Scaffold this active site. Structure first.
Site, short mmCIF file in Angstrom:
data_model
loop_
_atom_site.label_atom_id
_atom_site.label_comp_id
_atom_site.label_asym_id
_atom_site.label_seq_id
_atom_site.Cartn_x
_atom_site.Cartn_y
_atom_site.Cartn_z
N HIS A 63 75.97 62.33 35.29
CA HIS A 63 76.29 61.35 36.36
C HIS A 63 77.67 60.75 36.05
O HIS A 63 78.51 60.68 36.96
CB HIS A 63 75.26 60.25 36.40
CG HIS A 63 73.85 60.74 36.50
ND1 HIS A 63 73.38 61.44 37.59
CD2 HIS A 63 72.82 60.65 35.65
CE1 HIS A 63 72.11 61.73 37.42
NE2 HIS A 63 71.73 61.27 36.26
N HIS A 95 82.95 54.73 37.14
CA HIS A 95 82.75 55.35 38.43
C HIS A 95 84.11 55.67 39.01
O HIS A 95 85.01 54.82 38.93
CB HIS A 95 81.92 54.47 39.38
CG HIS A 95 80.63 53.98 38.78
ND1 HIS A 95 79.44 54.58 39.04
CD2 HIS A 95 80.36 53.00 37.91
CE1 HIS A 95 78.47 53.96 38.42
NE2 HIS A 95 78.99 53.06 37.65
N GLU A 105 82.88 50.87 42.98
CA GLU A 105 81.62 50.50 43.56
C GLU A 105 81.72 49.13 44.26
O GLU A 105 81.49 49.06 45.44
CB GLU A 105 80.59 50.52 42.42
CG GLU A 105 80.38 51.94 41.88
CD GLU A 105 79.02 52.11 41.26
OE1 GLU A 105 78.63 51.29 40.40
OE2 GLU A 105 78.35 53.06 41.68
N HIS A 118 82.39 49.76 33.86
CA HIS A 118 81.22 48.94 33.61
C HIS A 118 80.96 48.88 32.10
O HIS A 118 80.60 49.90 31.51
CB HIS A 118 80.01 49.48 34.30
CG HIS A 118 80.15 49.38 35.79
ND1 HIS A 118 79.42 50.11 36.69
CD2 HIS A 118 80.95 48.58 36.53
CE1 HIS A 118 79.73 49.79 37.90
NE2 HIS A 118 80.66 48.86 37.86
N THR A 197 73.52 49.85 39.53
CA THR A 197 74.00 50.60 40.68
C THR A 197 73.59 52.04 40.69
O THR A 197 73.95 52.78 41.65
CB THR A 197 75.52 50.55 40.79
OG1 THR A 197 76.09 51.35 39.76
CG2 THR A 197 76.05 49.15 40.83
N1 LIG Z 1 76.25 51.37 36.95
S1 LIG Z 1 75.36 50.32 36.12
O1 LIG Z 1 74.86 49.28 37.02
O2 LIG Z 1 76.10 49.83 34.97
C1 LIG Z 1 73.92 51.18 35.60
C2 LIG Z 1 74.18 52.18 34.51
N2 LIG Z 1 72.96 53.00 34.50
C3 LIG Z 1 72.10 52.93 33.44
O3 LIG Z 1 72.28 52.30 32.39
C4 LIG Z 1 70.89 53.84 33.59
C5 LIG Z 1 70.34 54.46 32.33
C6 LIG Z 1 69.10 53.81 31.87
C7 LIG Z 1 68.68 54.08 30.57
C8 LIG Z 1 67.54 53.53 30.04
C9 LIG Z 1 66.81 52.71 30.85
O4 LIG Z 1 65.66 52.13 30.39
C10 LIG Z 1 67.25 52.46 32.14
BR1 LIG Z 1 66.27 51.35 33.20
C11 LIG Z 1 68.38 52.99 32.68
N3 LIG Z 1 70.43 54.07 34.78
O5 LIG Z 1 69.33 54.95 34.78
ZN LIG Z 2 78.08 51.68 36.42
#
Ligand SMILES: NS(=O)(=O)CCNC(=O)/C(Cc1ccc(O)c(Br)c1)=N/O
Ligand SMILES: [Zn+2]
Ligand SMILES: NS(=O)(=O)CCNC(=O)/C(Cc1ccc(O)c(Br)c1)=N/O
Ligand SMILES: NS(=O)(=O)CCNC(=O)/C(Cc1ccc(O)c(Br)c1)=N/O
EC number: 4.2.1.1
Length: 259
Positions: A63, A95, A105, A118, A197
């Site tokens: 991703h 992103h 974003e 981020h 996000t």
């Molecule tokens: N763009 S952001 O808002 O910074 C979000 C960044 N995405 C993430 O950290 C994840 C990985 C994640 C890993 C372990 C978890 O237990 C959980 Br829940 C989510 N999304 O799956």
């Molecule tokens: Zn992010």
């Protein structure tokens, strides 16, 4: 298993089917309307304490790419501003767009930046990341916009390792990286309550979005765009446009730390 992405067939418009909180009341990102955000004189200054940061590894997760930190002690923390207590840096990622006119974003008066950084932190009162994401005050994400201009020297070590993690599932050592080199001069910010996000889109984030973008060079962002969403030996799909568009603000207020 998880089949979400950023394509026509599995992208942001599809997420809600597996993650219904996609249509929830505190989703991120949002447009920051600069003439509706209110300066809040009660906000404390923000404290970014990254002197003892310990970066570990960089990983292409299919991703984005994440730089992971040692979060087993209070080594790199965010405090102050809208936050109560201490939030530990666990990872950063970006992103970005296929072209310089999109990629962020959050937007600012509908303006899209080339990219957005981020820095993800979790609230130590909940003991680990997994528990933190189940709480409305569990995470603090520091968001920093990227525009294309002059090179950012403190980004170059990241750009130079990307050839070694081209495809999904590849990782590399990434020790001794100082995330202070990714910050702008000003810590002026907007803040609002929101969500991850990405799936699972949990509503656990206090967002802190810096007003001042950092400038990166066209060559630096070009290198981001050479990454791949796919794994080795699979059809090549460039890792571009891995951003969620702005979501309804609903019953939220964005506050400014500055006039
Ligand atoms: N763009 S952001 O808002 O910074 C979000 C960044 N995405 C993430 O950290 C994840 C990985 C994640 C890993 C372990 C978890 O237990 C959980 Br829940 C989510 N999304 O799956
Ligand atoms: Zn992010
Ligand atoms: N609501 S969602 O989690 O975003 C997306 C849910 N959609 C899907 O699983 C699919 C089938 C699919 C099958 C195999 C794959 O390897 C991938 Br990838 C996707 N969409 O075609
Ligand atoms: N229906 S839900 O609450 O969104 C499912 C919630 N899933 C979780 O908390 C997780 C962590 C997770 C990690 C990475 C991901 O990409 C996704 Br997605 C979820 N299970 O591993």
């Amino acid at each position: 298993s998880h089949h979400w992405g950023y394509g026509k067939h599995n992208g942001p418009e599809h997420w809600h089917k597996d993650f219904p909180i996609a249509k929830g009341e505190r989703q991120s990102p949002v447009d920051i309307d600069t003439h509706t955000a209110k300066y809040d004189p009660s906000l404390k200054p923000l404290s970014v304490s990254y002197d003892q940061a310990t970066s570990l590894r960089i990983l292409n997760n299919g991703h984005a790419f994440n730089v992971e930190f040692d979060d087993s002690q209070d080594k790199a923390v965010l405090k102050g501003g809208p936050l109560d207590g201490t939030y530990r840096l666990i990872q950063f990622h970006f992103h970005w767009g296929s072209l310089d006119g999109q990629g962020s974003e959050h937007t600012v008066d509908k303006k899209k930046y080339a990219a957005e950084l981020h820095l993800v932190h979790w609230n130590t009162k909940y003991g680990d990341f997994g528990k933190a994401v189940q709480q409305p005050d569990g995470l603090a994400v520091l968001g920093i916009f990227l525009k294309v201009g002059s090179a950012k020297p403190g980004l170059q070590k990241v750009v130079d390792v990307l050839d070694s993690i081209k495809t999904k599932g590849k990782s590399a050592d990434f020790t001794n990286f100082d995330p202070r080199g990714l910050l702008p001069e000003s810590l002026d910010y907007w803040t609002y309550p929101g969500s991850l996000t990405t799936p699972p889109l949990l509503e656990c984030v206090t967002w802190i979005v810096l007003k001042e973008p950092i400038s990166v060079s066209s060559e630096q962002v070009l290198k981001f765009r050479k990454l791949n969403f796919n794994g080795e030996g699979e059809p090549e799909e460039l890792m571009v446009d891995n951003w969620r568009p702005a979501q309804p603000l609903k019953n939220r207020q964005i506050k400014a730390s500055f006039k």
